[PDB]
Enzyme design. Sequence first.
Site, PDB file in Angstrom:
ATOM      1  N   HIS A 101     -21.699 -31.053   4.935  1.00 37.08           N
ATOM      2  CA  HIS A 101     -22.447 -32.079   4.214  1.00 37.08           C
ATOM      3  C   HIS A 101     -23.930 -31.736   4.005  1.00 37.08           C
ATOM      4  CE1 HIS A 101     -23.582 -34.273   8.103  1.00 37.08           C
ATOM      5  NE2 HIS A 101     -24.653 -34.538   7.378  1.00 37.08           N
ATOM      6  N   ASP A 128     -15.967 -30.888   8.419  1.00 39.34           N
ATOM      7  CA  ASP A 128     -17.421 -30.827   8.181  1.00 39.34           C
ATOM      8  C   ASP A 128     -18.107 -29.627   8.866  1.00 39.34           C
ATOM      9  OD1 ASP A 128     -19.827 -31.700   7.073  1.00 39.34           O
ATOM     10  OD2 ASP A 128     -20.148 -33.304   8.533  1.00 39.34           O
ATOM     11  N   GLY A 130     -31.225 -36.530  10.320  1.00 42.30           N
ATOM     12  CA  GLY A 130     -32.143 -35.418  10.501  1.00 42.30           C
ATOM     13  C   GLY A 130     -31.604 -34.429  11.530  1.00 42.30           C
ATOM     14  N   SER A 132     -28.295 -33.852  11.739  1.00 47.65           N
ATOM     15  CA  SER A 132     -27.085 -33.320  11.077  1.00 47.65           C
ATOM     16  C   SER A 132     -27.009 -31.795  11.065  1.00 47.65           C
ATOM     17  CB  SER A 132     -27.018 -33.772   9.608  1.00 47.65           C
ATOM     18  OG  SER A 132     -26.723 -35.145   9.456  1.00 47.65           O
ATOM     19  N   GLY A 133     -25.823 -31.255  11.364  1.00 46.01           N
ATOM     20  CA  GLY A 133     -25.635 -29.805  11.374  1.00 46.01           C
ATOM     21  C   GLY A 133     -26.005 -29.095  12.671  1.00 46.01           C
ATOM     22  N   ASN A 135     -42.441 -26.880  17.706  1.00 48.68           N
ATOM     23  CA  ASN A 135     -43.110 -27.894  16.879  1.00 48.68           C
ATOM     24  C   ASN A 135     -43.040 -27.368  15.438  1.00 48.68           C
ATOM     25  OD1 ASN A 135     -44.977 -29.445  15.363  1.00 48.68           O
ATOM     26  ND2 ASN A 135     -46.192 -29.878  17.198  1.00 48.68           N
TER      27      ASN A 135
HETATM   28  N1  LIG Z   1     -24.588 -40.099  15.382  1.00 47.15           N
HETATM   29  C1  LIG Z   1     -24.774 -40.310  13.928  1.00 47.15           C
HETATM   30  C2  LIG Z   1     -25.387 -39.085  13.275  1.00 47.15           C
HETATM   31  C3  LIG Z   1     -25.672 -39.255  11.806  1.00 47.15           C
HETATM   32  C4  LIG Z   1     -26.090 -40.483  11.301  1.00 47.15           C
HETATM   33  C5  LIG Z   1     -26.368 -40.642   9.944  1.00 47.15           C
HETATM   34  C6  LIG Z   1     -26.223 -39.559   9.077  1.00 47.15           C
HETATM   35  C7  LIG Z   1     -25.805 -38.329   9.573  1.00 47.15           C
HETATM   36  C8  LIG Z   1     -25.532 -38.183  10.933  1.00 47.15           C
HETATM   37 CA   LIG Z   2     -43.817 -23.993  14.705  1.00 50.72          CA
END
Ligand SMILES: [NH3+]CCc1ccccc1
Ligand SMILES: [Ca+2]
Length: 222
Positions: A40, A84, A174, A176-177, A54
């Site tokens: 995704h 996925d 954020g 994700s992956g 950072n």
């Molecule tokens: N534990 C949920 C993780 C998540 C939530 C929303 C979009 C992508 C991934």
């Molecule tokens: Ca850095």
Amino acid sequence: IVGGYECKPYSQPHQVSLNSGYHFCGGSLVNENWVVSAAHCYKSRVEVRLGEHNIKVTEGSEQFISSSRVIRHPNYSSYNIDNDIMLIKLSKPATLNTYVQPVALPTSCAPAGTMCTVSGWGNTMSSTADSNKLQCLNIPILSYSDCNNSYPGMITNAMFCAGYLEGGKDSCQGDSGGPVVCNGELQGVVSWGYGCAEPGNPGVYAKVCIFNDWLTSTMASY
Ligand SMILES: [NH3+]CCc1ccccc1
Ligand SMILES: [Ca+2]
């Protein structure tokens, strides 16, 4: 990452950030030429950033490398977000050192109850936790029965739930992956869920162990 803590710098050396003008997804380095992430998060070309703590500050440990190939699983489906997983080939091999090291693929499928670690630069929903600094969290794998009970008929052979039914601790947008590591091996990839850290709605992850044949056969090409 909601309800976690700032990771000790470079304690998760396999963690990478996918960038297209800004950070949009995470990933894991599995060897000098390949990265594993979620289907995704697909884009035809991306910049892989390794050796980060950072993401808004130049630390001197970073390596920025463009992709030469992005391969999504052939059976990916948006109906239930099945299969996925995705592979990214680096245009030049990464240099392994104190800051950059790969994570091992599974020698088995981890059973319910195993404690694991998940990490990322996503939403923290906290007034004191800085998402620009890599966050870490320990979560247990849940049974199939509890996972299916939370999301009736939506859990396939390629997924597993991990976290707490009470809510309060979870991965979020954020993240994700990114990686889910157990006993020193990559067991999961951050995939989906209903909201973040809500009671009765644990996080869902792609089950890496059942994809071993596709992963190894695909990497046998350069
Ligand atoms: N534990 C949920 C993780 C998540 C939530 C929303 C979009 C992508 C991934
Ligand atoms: Ca850095």
